[PDB]
């Protein structure tokens, strides 16, 4: 009934594991094979199907290494993910939004036949850490044809993103001092239209750099979000709605959404 559904029926354990159910391979993208971004790496399911595609930017001073685990982990759940370097490491969010776009177009039009044939180019999503997350918001603002956006501990000069209609999961870190949620993640989140699918997830005991190491909360709810909105996969709705618990036994500091989806 839903032709975009991929992989087995999800469970907490399956979404929390270090790798998802899809066996993945890599395609190196060097700086000078890449037009409009700094190169990177494509992770793609070996299983010959079509999948949605994700571009992931790092933040200020950061490299591909800072986000690599997340691209691989997400690809292992049924997506073609590019994890990029930026033209320079000090690039600002709007240029990073352009690079996420250049990275999406590389995967669709420029990569090998192996990668291009595995992409449903109509079902695309962007993610970014920090300034990379502001990049995600800007491109989402400019490309309402995108299916999902996941800004991680995001920063942008502008926090008013009421122009975004792309389903957005804002992830914050409670101990973040580089992009405090008081001044960034939360103002950003509340700006997004109450009429779109959106969620706000704040990690507990998390610094700005929590997204830069394997984190099973980030991995779980990123995959759940991309599944629901890139694949329209309603098997994943129950993970987002009502969504993660706070408190002593729960897995998060705070969670808000526009559930039900």
Author numbering: 41 to 301
Can you list sentences taken from the study reporting this PDB entry?
Cutinase is an esterase that belongs to the α/β-hydrolase superfamily and primarily hydrolyzes cutin from plants. Unlike lipases, cutinases lack the active site-covering lid structure such that the substrate-binding cleft is exposed and directly accessible from bulk solution. In addition, the substrate-binding site is more expansive in cutinases compared to esterases, benefiting the binding of bulkier macromolecules.
We thus turned to a BTa-like compound MHET, which is composed of TPA and ethylene glycol linked via an ester bond. As a result, the structure of the S170A variant was determined in apo- and MHET-bound forms to 2.21 and 1.82 Å resolutions, respectively. The apo-form of S170A did not have an observable difference compared to TfCut-DM (Cα RMSD, 0.277 Å).
